[PDB]
Design a protein around this ligand. Structure first.
Ligand SMILES: [Cu+2]
Lengths: 67, 67
C-alpha cells in the first residue's frame, strides 16, 4: 500500500528529520516533497504505525489517503 | 538538574518540533536557542530520557553537559 501524508515541513532540515525517523522504523520506501509538504510511503506497516512514527518528529501530520 | 543539548535545528519549524516533543514528555522547563542550535532543559528526568526524547525528532542531538 502507498500511503500519503501531509507533514508541515518548512526547511530541508525538517525533510531530513522525516527521512531519519522513517529509516529507524524500516520496512519503508518513501519520497518527501518539501514544497508540497507531502510524504508518500510504500509499506506493509499499518497506517497507525506510520502516523505515530511521523508524529514523533514533533511536526503536524495528517493523513491524505491511500492507494 | 540543568542539562544542555545541541540540536541541529535550521528553521523555526525545527524549534517548534523540539518544543512539541518536550511538552509531550512533560516535567521540563526549557529554552531553545535556534541560531546557536542549543536547547537547555531543567528536569528531574534522566539525561537518558531527555536525550531519547530529543532524538525522537530525527534531528542530530548531542550533549553539552550539566550547566
Ligand atoms: Cu526546519
Amino acid at each position: 500500500p502507498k500511503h500519503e501524508f501531509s507533514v508541515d515541513m518548512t526547511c530541508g532540515g525538517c525533510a531530513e528529520a522525516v527521512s531519519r525517523v522513517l529509516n529507524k522504523l524500516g520496512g519503508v520506501k518513501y519520497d518527501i516533497d518539501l514544497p508540497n509538504k507531502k510524504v508518500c510511503i510504500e509499506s506493509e506497516h499499518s497506517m497507525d504505525t506510520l502516523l505515530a512514527t511521523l508524529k514523533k518528529t514533533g511536526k503536524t501530520v495528517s493523513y491524505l489517503g491511500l492507494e
